[PDB]
Design goal:
chaperone/chaperone inhibitor, alpha+beta, binds ligand EFT, ATP binding, CHAPERONE-CHAPERONE INHIBITOR complex, Heat Shock Protein 90
């Protein structure tokens, strides 16, 4: 288990998301589904030049898994996945410029729902989640588990759990007052409203 400090700009962004009064929390789902969609586009692209990249799984889909017992909402995709380098430094560094631009926009009159237009859409998970776990598997790397309850740090470890093949699993450990996001009709309503034109099948699992 390795512990890392978030880059200063990211930590500020996470504090902003956790502390600002913002009722329109549902936008987190569209951001996560959109990222899943982009990771699926990437793998499909790489498969045109190298068809052997689909050996780790041919199906390109998005699964929404609520679990009321565990109070978790899981977003699973069979996309490109991420390497340990993507989890640690790479994604944090591209986010640096996006965060600055986003924080400047909020000061200029923009709202939190515009987060994805700055490429930092992921962190909107912190509107609803007290902890986020990211399980990922890229073709050129091992299965890793990223985790953060915010507070300026995240952890990375080799995941010894159930193998995935290829893709990313985002586990949202929901805050006590955000259980509506485990309800079928609420999820259906959000997906219909915000993710009506995603080019992959989205399956909402039942409990
Ligand atoms: N971008 C992005 C995040 C990854 C997150 C990893 C840990 C550091 C912060 C970014 C993300 N959210 N949802 C996804 C779905 C994917 O198929 C791949 C990446 C993501």
């Amino acid at each position: 288990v390795e512990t890392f400090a978030f880059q200063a700009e990211i930590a500020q962004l996470m504090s902003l998301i956790i502390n600002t009064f913002y009722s329109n929390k549902e936008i987190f789902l569209r951001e996560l589904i959109s990222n899943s969609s982009d990771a699926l586009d990437k793998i499909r692209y790489e498969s045109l030049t190298d068809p052997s990249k689909l050996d780790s799984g041919k199906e390109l889909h998005i699964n929404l898994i609520p679990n009321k017992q565990d109070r978790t909402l899981t977003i699973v995709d069979t996309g490109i996945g991420m390497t340990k380098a993507d989890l640690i430094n790479n994604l944090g560094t591209i986010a640096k410029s996006g965060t600055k631009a986003f924080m400047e926009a909020l000061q200029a009159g923009a709202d939190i729902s515009m987060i994805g237009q700055f490429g930092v859409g992921f962190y909107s998970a912190y509107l609803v989640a007290e902890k986020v776990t990211v399980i990922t598997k890229h073709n050129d790397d091992e299965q890793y588990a990223w985790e953060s309850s915010a507070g300026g740090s995240f952890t990375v470890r080799t995941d010894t759990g159930e193998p995935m093949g290829r893709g990313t699993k985002v586990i949202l450990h929901l805050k006590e007052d955000q259980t509506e996001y485990l309800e079928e009709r609420r999820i259906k309503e959000i997906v219909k409203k915000h993710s009506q034109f995603i080019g992959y099948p989205i399956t909402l699992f039942v409990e």
